Structure formats: structure tokens, C-alpha cells
Design a binder for this molecule. Structure first.
Ligand SMILES: *[C@@H]1O[C@H](CO)[C@@H](O[C@@H]2O[C@H](CO)[C@@H](O[C@@H]3O[C@H](CO[C@H]4O[C@H](CO)[C@@H](O)[C@H](O[C@H]5O[C@H](CO)[C@@H](O)[C@H](O)[C@@H]5O[C@H]5O[C@H](CO)[C@@H](O)[C@H](O)[C@@H]5O)[C@@H]4O)[C@@H](O)[C@H](O[C@H]4O[C@H](CO)[C@@H](O)[C@H](O)[C@@H]4O[C@H]4O[C@H](CO)[C@@H](O)[C@H](O)[C@@H]4O)[C@@H]3O)[C@H](O)[C@H]2NC(C)=O)[C@H](O)[C@H]1NC(C)=O
Ligand SMILES: O=C(OCc1ccc(OC(F)(F)F)cc1)N1C[C@@H]2CN(C(=O)c3ccc4[nH]nnc4c3)C[C@H]2C1
Ligand SMILES: [Ca+2]
Ligand SMILES: [Ca+2]
Ligand SMILES: [Cl-]
Ligand SMILES: [Cl-]
Ligand SMILES: [Cl-]
Ligand SMILES: [Cl-]
Ligand code: NA
Ligand SMILES: [Zn+2]
Length: 808
């Protein structure tokens, strides 16, 4: 209950929220039904519209006007945005040439360039090119400022998860907003779009920019705008705030447009009805820049024009129903649409079983338009698992489709022609980023980047220290003229041992055999050199990875590869090797098929054993450096050392063998040599972070050999591929993956076919950033290159997406 008897008289859009129940006059009062009786009358004036006309010039101030064209309006800070154009013969901002903004040109008493975030809902990246004829103001921001061809949103590509990721720098799994609709089983509470539950603070985790700014003494305008406040009034309110006295005036502001998303849902992303909403957005940008120009702020403010996600063509006919798959359809709750999330309808149902729900949903129809996953098996690049609000069973829905529980849900709850929410690597879900202002670069294009990185830069723009977040601070320094953040590489925590030969063959009792007893300081001085690091510069191109946690490990050198071998996990953390364009693929000789060899540098006590693998009927083993790529028959024996072996399910060995035997050489051919770093990942609590030894849930039977949940590889070459990967003088090019180590290939519906028809598609789906691997392994890569550290941070956040080029 609000006592709405006070007045908004001189308090319209006041910046401090007054507490219940004195009545409110802010942009949130509508939402709370708490506005004073006279809010509409005083604060939402509309009389005469939004533009000055010639006859209004010099007019006597009438306070009933929505905005003013009288003489004192500039200093009251409430002229119509077109005032100086119509009444003082100025030009519109968009008609002015652009002129580099080398330094902030701010009125006296500004302590820093203000930041205005202009966010547009559903603005698909390709609208920048496709609607460019109708968006002159936006086009000028983009061509004169700093722009990316697109900005990658987070998954799911829904509105609240992405705006709040923009505000926090966090994955939805960490900030808590994991969908537009949620159930938190600890609170036993549901979050919905329609309602009041959603303002409750416990939903909203992390620290959004307005809080970061406030705690560090920088004032913020309101980030939230009520749907019914027109855009023109939002712009006028921001401009009026920008006229407040120094001590009251915020330094950071946000504007939010419901368009073009709102029309895109009804008409599809390129519906003919979409031109008008894009024109209208542009006219709004124009009104903002004209207003800044009248305030002498158009070369002072940094403006970010940013979207939350794109829009895809989706219609009612393209809906999959779970009632076509499950016999038990009424025992589940589905969160439906462009993603699916499934849990039991009642926790009292002891007959509920996820494994049979998943099996019933797996590769059941030839053309099935969704794929089920337990959340821990989703591609690690989605970072969508570590939150009790995310249901264990997830459905990744194909672009252009929906999932629903039953047909009745769709026709008794087409309505719509656009939607979003799909996998955040999908081209239609990509959105926009333009930065313009003194602090951004002039006429500069930057490569695509992810929206989790912006928070850090918004902090940089405002002189704020960012709260702990998922951006990689420094990876976007190339967008900025000044205020760059110059990080130092993290310090290596554990230093390696460099073991020499210390054990005899007969000290090992590993149950391993190898056909290797047929074997001149010619090729004997030579093999000692190799074991001491002599080819190390060929195979370790960017320095050894640093270990950022406390552990005990050994560096092992070989002719064809180098590894960091963990005495704690009994297998390498990393194995590094270079394959030139000219390298040749060989087969394992018949006599060597089952050969495993003890490594006389590493104690039996810190070695795996073949017995454990014999006894474990589920688990087999693979090798990290592949025997097929050995440089010579003699070198091949090194690839069978017990210290290069790793546990692998037979089903996964099909995937790994095709990668090692076919794809590595294929990449070396295409990229002019590659350097590969591969290793194991252990993430049994699915938090995207390396597991300690006591988190490991599965061991090779009867042994202490931990089973990885994933295997990674990072494949680096020269960005200028006329130079070979081992002699590259400039920027690097990388692609990486984090493959899940699963005992079946159920994820791949074509898996009974030859690996040539399905393994590469699987790998593409599990593409990753090098930074993702760093979190998961506690390693830091690329420590010794000839590149700037910021450029290396950018390379580590790179995601190879495999989508075709954005456009047509
Ligand atoms: C992306 O970036 C983010 C941000 O940097 C990374 O997330 C951080 O990861 C850290 C490691 O997981 C984690 O640190 C922990 O902090 C605990 C205190 O946490 C509270 O305080 C902070 C600070 O204000 C706050 O941010 C937290 O907010 C979380 O929880 C609230 C309420 O649920 C949410 O509103 C909010 O959205 C956020 O949720 C997310 O994080 C939590 C984990 O905290 C998840 O459970 C959620 O699903 C969601 O993902 C908190 O309010 C601190 O208590 C922890 O210390 C324990 O563990 C260590 C183990 O060594 C030990 O030393 C301690 O003694 C303690 O152990 C005891 O508790 C154990 C577990 O209960 C118990 O088993 C033991 O026996 C012990 O008794 C820990 O240090 C940090 O909170 C999050 N921060 C955020 C914002 O998410 C994220 O990792 C990055 N992602 C990637 C891939 O890089
Ligand atoms: O006023 C707002 O914006 C604050 C802001 C700005 C920049 C921000 O970014 C940053 F912090 F970085 F500046 C953060 C918050 N908002 C955002 C909210 C969206 N919404 C929906 O009902 C909704 C909308 C579109 C959908 N499509 N499909 N389902 C949908 C559901 C209410 C709106 C009010
Ligand atoms: Ca076995
Ligand atoms: Ca983990
Ligand atoms: Cl959702
Ligand atoms: Cl299989
Ligand atoms: Cl550990
Ligand atoms: Cl596109
Ligand atoms: Na399969
Ligand atoms: Zn939408």
C-alpha cells in the first residue's frame, strides 16, 4: 500500500528513490503503482509534441509544453532537441562532417566524459548494413566511431539474461538471470516477465554497473524505463539530467528501446514492417545527438550503441511437441520456446527419471529439430550449467524452431514470426556494438567480441574498478584511444621439475608390454639431445604454459613433442607439438598396436598402469601426442610412453582418432603448419573451473587414475598463412575445442556412420576460447610471443564459430 497523496511538483524523475509510502515520481513508479496523483500531468507532458516549429521560436515559456522553444530554455536545460536547428539556424548533428575527437571537449565543471549507453532490444547485427539507408544517425556513429561487424550475446539469447550480462560482465549462470522465466527451488519462487516477483533483489546476482559506479562515488541515471514513457521523454529526461549542477549530475546514463525487437517478433527480422521501427530508432539517436550538441556535449560524451541479441524467423508451424516423444508428458514441466528446460512436475513423483526422458528424446525422428542434453554435457562455451535455476535436462533447439510440451500449448495459451533465444553462435542472434566519443577510436573497425567483455570497458570509461567478472580485462583495449587497462601476466605458481633418467625398466610392474627389443653414438648422442630439449623450440612455440595453482609436475621432452606431466593426476596437463604443412601421416605398425612403455624419467608410483585398463571393461586409453604423426619410426616409440597415455572410452576414441589421424594433418595443410596443445580437463561440478583432486567423481577401476570429463586442443598458426606456423613473425590465428569425454556418441545422431560424416560437426559444436580452457585447467598459454599482451588477451577470447560470414 502506497499513500499517493504527495506531489511530483519539482520532483519529476528525481534521482534518489524515496521509500514506501511517500509517493514516487521516478521511472519505476508506474511498475510499483506508486506514482503521485499528478505524475502524468507534471512529469509526462505531451502538449505541442517534441519539435520546435518556426513560430514557436522565442515564444513565451508555457510550462504545459512537452518541451520549449523560448529563450531561457537552454539554461533551464529543456529545449526541444531540434531547438537550435529551427530557431538559431544550427545544423542537425547528422549533417555535420565527422571530425576526429582527439580529446574530450567538455564544458567547465565536467570531471570526466559522461557515458550514455543506448541499448536496442532485438537489433540483429545485419541491420547495420541492411537498413543502413534508413538509419543515417546510426550510420554516422558507426562509420565515425569504433564499431565491430557484430557482438556475440550470451546464451540463452533472451532479453533479461543479456541486458544483465551487459551490466555485470557475468555469464547468466553467475548473475542468476538464466532465462526470461525461472524457478528457484531453494526459494521455491518463480520469476516471470509479467509481475512483481522480478523486482525482488534475490534474483539479481553480481554487481551491475550502476552499483559499481555508485559505490565508487560516480552517480548514475536510471537504467530502467517504464514501457509507457515515450522515447522522446526518455531522451529529454537524460538531457535534463545532463544540465543538473556538478554535484548532482550523473556521469553514466542508459536509454532502452523496445524496438526493433517488438516489431521483429510480430513481423520477423526482415518483414517489410521493420523499416519504420529502424527509422524511428534512428530519429531517436538523432534527437539525442542534437540535444548533446545544444549542450556542447557532443564531443565530450562517450555513446555506446549496443544490442542485447538479434532475431530469427520462427513461426507456429515450426514447433516440436514433447507429446510426440514422451508417453509420460504430464509428469514433466517444460520451460518452452527457443530453448527447452525440463524438470519433474512434482518432487513427490518417485517414478520420475531423467535418463529415460533423455533417451526418449534422443535421435527419435530423422529430422528432429532439437537435441536433449544433461546440462553438464552442453558445450562448455555456453557456460550454462552452474546454477540451481538451470534444470538438469536442457533442449538445444535448432534455429527457426520452437519446442512445446503439447499442441494445446501453442493454440490455447500464427501469433508471431520472429523470436530469439537460440545458441549464441547462431548468425541471426548476433547483435551490434558501436562506440563513439573522445575515449573510443576514430573510424576504426574491431573484430567481433562477446558482450561479457563490455562491463570492464564501461568501468574503464568511467574510471571505475570493475567488480570480479567474466570479461578478460585488457582484451578490448584496442577499442580505446586512452583509459586502456594494462594488465600484467599472472605469476606462475608451480615450477616444473626436469627429471632425467632415474628408473630401470624392471622397477616397473604396470602390466604393459611393448615389442621394442631390437636396437653407434651417431643416433645415440642424438636421442639424448632430444630428451634434453633440443627440438623444444620447434614444438613449444609460445613458451611453456604456466601452472597457476599449487601442484607437482615434470617437463618431459621428446623429438616430436613436449609435455607437462602431472604427478598428482598421473598424466599430462598439456602436451605441445608442431606439425608442418609437409609432415606425413603414418599408421601404427601391427607389432606396436598394444605397446605401452614405462618412462624411465618418472617413478612407477607416479605412472599409470595397463592392468587398470585391462580390468576396467568400460575404459580404454588414447595418447595425447598421436603416434600417427611421429617424425620417424624410432621417434614413434616415444608416443607409446606410459606418460603420454590418457584414459578414453572406446566411443570417444573414435572421435579422438579421427581428430589425430585425419584432422590435424588437414589443418596443417590448410593453415601452413599448426602447433597443437592438447590435454585433459576435469570439471565434475560443471562450474567451468579446474577441479581439485578431491572433486574427481570417477577413476579408472581399481586405480588412482582420474577420468577427464573433457579433452581440449588449441591449434595455433600464423595469421598470415604465407608464413609457416614455426616461423611466424606477426599476429597468430587460433581455434580450440573442449570435447566432452562421453562413453557413447548419443549426441551425434549420425555416429554409426564413418567418422568422416559426423566427427567434425561434433568438434564444431564444441568450439571454445583459449580463455575457456585456461579457466578449466588453471594453465596460462602464450606466455612468450612477440605480441603485445593485450593482443594476446584478444586472441585468447577468440571463438572460431564456423558460421558462414554475416550478411548474404
Ligand atoms: C565468472 O566470474 C564470476 C565472478 O568472479 C566467477 O564466480 C565466482 O566464483 C568464485 C568461485 O566459485 C566464488 O567464490 C565463492 O564465494 C563465496 C561467497 O559468495 C558470496 O559472496 C559473493 C561476493 O559478494 C557473491 O558474489 C556470491 O554471489 C553468488 O551467490 C548468490 C546467492 O546464491 C547469487 O545472487 C549470485 O548470483 C552468485 O551466484 C553464483 O555463484 C555461486 C557460488 O558462490 C553459485 O553457487 C551460483 O550458482 C551462481 O553461479 C555469494 O553471495 C565463498 O563463500 C566461497 O568459499 C567456499 O569454497 C571454498 C573452497 O575452497 C572455501 O575456501 C571456503 O571455505 C568456502 O567453502 C565452504 O562452503 C562450501 C560450499 O558451500 C562447503 O562445501 C565447504 O565445506 C565450506 O564450508 C567462494 O570463495 C564467487 O562467489 C563467484 N561469484 C559470483 C558473482 O558468481 C565465476 O567463477 C566465473 N566463471 C568462470 C567460468 O570463470
Ligand atoms: O528499461 C529497461 O532497460 C534497462 C537497461 C538498459 C541497458 C542495460 O545495459 C547496461 F547496463 F549495460 F547498460 C541494462 C538495463 N528494460 C529492459 C527490459 C526488457 N523488458 C521486457 O519486458 C522484454 C523485452 C523484450 C523481449 N523480447 N522477448 N522477450 C522480452 C521481454 C522490460 C524492459 C525494461
Ligand atoms: Ca578396458
Ligand atoms: Ca570444476
Ligand atoms: Cl527462458
Ligand atoms: Cl560409438
Ligand atoms: Cl589440485
Ligand atoms: Cl545474418
Ligand atoms: Na549416435
Ligand atoms: Zn524479444
Amino acid at each position: 500500500w502506497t499513500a499517493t497523496s504527495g506531489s511530483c511538483k519539482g520532483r519529476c524523475f528525481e534521482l534518489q528513490e524515496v521509500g514506501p509510502p511517500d509517493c514516487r515520481c521516478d521511472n519505476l513508479c508506474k511498475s510499483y503503482s506508486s506514482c503521485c496523483h499528478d505524475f502524468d500531468e507534471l512529469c509526462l507532458k505531451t502538449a505541442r509534441g517534441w519539435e520546435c516549429t518556426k513560430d514557436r521560436c522565442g515564444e513565451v515559456r508555457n510550462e504545459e509544453n512537452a518541451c520549449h522553444c523560448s529563450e531561457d530554455c537552454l539554461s533551464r536545460g529543456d529545449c526541444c532537441t531540434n531547438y537550435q536547428v529551427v530557431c538559431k539556424g544550427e545544423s542537425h548533428w547528422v549533417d555535420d562532417d565527422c571530425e576526429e575527437i582527439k580529446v574530450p571537449e567538455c564544458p567547465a565543471g565536467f570531471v570526466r566524459p559522461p557515458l550514455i549507453i543506448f541499448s536496442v532490444d532485438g537489433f540483429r547485427a545485419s541491420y547495420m548494413k541492411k537498413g543502413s539507408k534508413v538509419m543515417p544517425n546510426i550510420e554516422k556513429l558507426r562509420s565515425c566511431g569504433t564499431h565491430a561487424p557484430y557482438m556475440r550475446p550470451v546464451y540463452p539469447t533472451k532479453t533479461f539474461p543479456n541486458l544483465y550480462t551487459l551490466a555485470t560482465g557475468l555469464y547468466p549462470e553467475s548473475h542468476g538471470i538464466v532465462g526470461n522465466s525461472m524457478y528457484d527451488p531453494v526459494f521455491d519462487a518463480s520469476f516471470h516477465l509479467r509481475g512483481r516477483e522480478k523486482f525482488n533483489h534475490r534474483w539479481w546476482g553480481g554487481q551491475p554497473l550502476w552499483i559499481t559506479a555508485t559505490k565508487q562515488g560516480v552517480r548514475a541515471g536510471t537504467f530502467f524505463w517504464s514501457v509507457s514513457i515515450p522515447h522522446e521523454r526518455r531522451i529529454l529526461t537524460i538531457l535534463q539530467w545532463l544540465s543538473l549542477p556538478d554535484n548532482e549530475r550523473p556521469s553514466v546514463y542508459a536509454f532502452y528501446s523496445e524496438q526493433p525487437d517488438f516489431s521483429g517478433h510480430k513481423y520477423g527480422p526482415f518483414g517489410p514492417e521493420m523499416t519504420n521501427p529502424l527509422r524511428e530508432i534512428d530519429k531517436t539517436v538523432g534527437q539525442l545527438m542534437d540535444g548533446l550538441k545544444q549542450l556542447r556535449l557532443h564531443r565530450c560524451v562517450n555513446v555506446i550503441f549496443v544490442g542485447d541479441h538479434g532475431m530469427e524467423d520462427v513461426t507456429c508451424d515450426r514447433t516440436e511437441f514433447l507429446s510426440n516423444y514422451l508417453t509420460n508428458v504430464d509428469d514433466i514441466t517444460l520451460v518452452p520456446g527457443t530453448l527447452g528446460r525440463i524438470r519433474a512436475k512434482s518432487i513427490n513423483n518417485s517414478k520420475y527419471d531423467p535418463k529415460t526422458i533423455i533417451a526418449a528424446l534422443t535421435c527419435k525422428k530423422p529430422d528432429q529439430h532439437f537435441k536433449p542434453y544433461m546440462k553438464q554435457h552442453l558445450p562448455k562455451r555456453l557456460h550454462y550449467a552452474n546454477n540451481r535455476r538451470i534444470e538438469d535436462i536442457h533442449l538445444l533447439v535448432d534455429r527457426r524452431w520452437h519446442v512445446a510440451r503439447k499442441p494445446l500449448d501453442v493454440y490455447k495459451k500464427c501469433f508471431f514470426q520472429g523470436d530469439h533465444g537460440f545458441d549464441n553462435k547462431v548468425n541471426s542472434m548476433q547483435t551490434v556494438f558501436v562506440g563513439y566519443g573522445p575515449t573510443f577510436k576514430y573510424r576504426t573497425k574491431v573484430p567481433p567480441f562477446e558482450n561479457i567483455e563490455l562491463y570492464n570497458v564501461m568501468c574503464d570509461l568511467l574510471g571505475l574498478k570493475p567488480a570480479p567478472n567474466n570479461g578478460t580485462h585488457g582484451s578490448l583495449n584496442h577499442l580505446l584511444r586512452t583509459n586502456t587497462f594494462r594488465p600484467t601476466m599472472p605469476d606462475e605458481v608451480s615450477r616444473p621439475n626436469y627429471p632425467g633418467i632415474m628408473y630401470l625398466q624392471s622397477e616397473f610392474d604396470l602390466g604393459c608390454t611393448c615389442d621394442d627389443k631390437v636396437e653407434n653414438k651417431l643416433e645415440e648422442l642424438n636421442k639424448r639431445l632430444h630428451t634434453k630439449g633440443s627440438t623444444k623450440e620447434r614444438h613449444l612455440l609460445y613458451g611453456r604454459p604456466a601452472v597457476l595453482y599449487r601442484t607437482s609436475y615434470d617437463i618431459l621432452y621428446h623429438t616430436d613433442f613436449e609435455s607437462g606431466y602431472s604427478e598428482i593426476f598421473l598424466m599430462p596437463l598439456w602436451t605441445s607439438y608442431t606439425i608442418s604443412k609437409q609432415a606425413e601421416v603414418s599408421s601404427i605398425p601391427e607389432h606396436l598396436t598394444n605397446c605401452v612403455r614405462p618412462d624411465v624419467r618418472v617413478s612407477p608410483g607416479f605412472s599409470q598402469n595397463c592392468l587398470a585398463y585391462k580390468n576396467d571393461k568400460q575404459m580404454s586409453y588414447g595418447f595425447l601426442f598421436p603416434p600417427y604423426l611421429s617424425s620417424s619410426p624410432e621417434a614413434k616409440y616415444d608416443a607409446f610412453l606410459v606418460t603420454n597415455m590418457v584414459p578414453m572410452y572406446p566411443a570417444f576414441k573414435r572421435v579422438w582418432a579421427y581428430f589425430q589421424r585425419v584432422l590435424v594433418k588437414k589443418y596443417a595443410s590448410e593453415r601452413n603448419g599448426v602447433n597443437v596443445i592438447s590435454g585433459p580437463i576435469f570439471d565434475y561440478n560443471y562450474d567451468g573451473l579446474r577441479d581439485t583432486e578431491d572433486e574427481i567423481k570417477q577413476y579408472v577401476e581399481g586405480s588412482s587414475i582420474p577420468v577427464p570429463t573433457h579433452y581440449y586442443s588449441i591449434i595455433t598458426s600464423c595469421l598470415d598463412f604465407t608464413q609457416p606456423a614455426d616461423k611466424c613473425d606477426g599476429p597468430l590465428s587460433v581455434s580450440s575445442f573442449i570435447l566432452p569425454h562421453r562413453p557413447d556418441n548419443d549426441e551425434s545422431c549420425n555416429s554409426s556412420e564413418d567418422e568422416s560424416k559426423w566427427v567434425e560437426e561434433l568438434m564444431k559444436m564444441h568450439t571454445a576460447r583459449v580463455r575457456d580452457i585456461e579457466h578449466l585447467t588453471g594453465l596460462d598459454f602464450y606466455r612468450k610471443t612477440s605480441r603485445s599482451y593485450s593482443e594476446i588477451l584478444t586472441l585468447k577470447t577468440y571463438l572460431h564459430t564456423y558460421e558462414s560470414e554475416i550478411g548474404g
